[PDB]
Design goal:
The PDB classes it as viral protein. It is built from 6 helices and 9 strands. By secondary structure, the chain is α/β, with parallel strands linked by helices. Strand 2 and strand 3 form a beta hairpin. The radius of gyration is 16 Å and the shape is globular. The two termini are 24 Å apart. The structure holds manganese (II) ion (2 copies).
């Protein structure tokens, strides 16, 4: 009935010391469309405790691949791989050939895995989010509900709304499943 019971959300929950130690990065990108924004996400993954930690984000309603590229490079986030929304193959091309993000690549998994990717995140021991670092990830994950069906009963799919960092996280971890 209520998803992501595993959330840990508090301002300051991730210190700068911790961020420095994080050495197992996963990054994802949803591209945005119409009213929907571009969402880049960067996480650290603790496989031995089954937890993920939100390190940084970029959410942008006025979608600019240049600006997204400038941000990734400015912060030195291009040493790590980015798994991107594969519905925009030319946006992926552009980041790579146009803007120098060499380690960007398309989500291999299809639209018949959303449900499973969402379950995988949901079954993590903990999803740790500092709203001072990643406030959009915090808002989305905190407020996202399950879709309800014809009757009004809940179903195993998250709402397809205000879920851009969620999607982006799903892409980021798709090889870890
Ligand atoms: Mn998308
Ligand atoms: Mn989206």
């Amino acid at each position: 009935v209520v998803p992501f019971e595993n959330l840990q959300i508090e301002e300051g929950i991730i210190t700068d010391a911790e961020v420095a130690r994080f050495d197992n990065i996963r990054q994802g990108l949803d591209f945005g469309y119409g009213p929907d924004p571009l969402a880049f996400v960067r996480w650290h993954y603790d496989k031995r405790k089954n937890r993920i930690y939100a390190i940084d984000e970029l959410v942008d309603h006025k979608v600019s691949l240049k600006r997204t590229a400038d941000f990734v490079r400015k912060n030195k986030y291009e040493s790590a791989r980015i798994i991107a929304d594969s519905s925009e193959p030319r946006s992926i091309d552009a980041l790579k050939l146009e803007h120098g993000i060499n380690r960007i690549e398309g989500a291999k998994k299809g639209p018949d895995s959303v449900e499973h990717g969402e379950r995988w995140l949901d079954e993590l021991d903990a999803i740790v989010i500092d709203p001072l670092r990643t406030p959009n990830i915090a808002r989305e994950f905190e407020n996202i509900d399950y879709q309800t069906d014809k009757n009004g009963d809940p179903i195993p799919r998250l709402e397809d709304k205000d879920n851009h960092t969620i999607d982006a996280t799903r892409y980021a971890f798709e090889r870890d499943m």
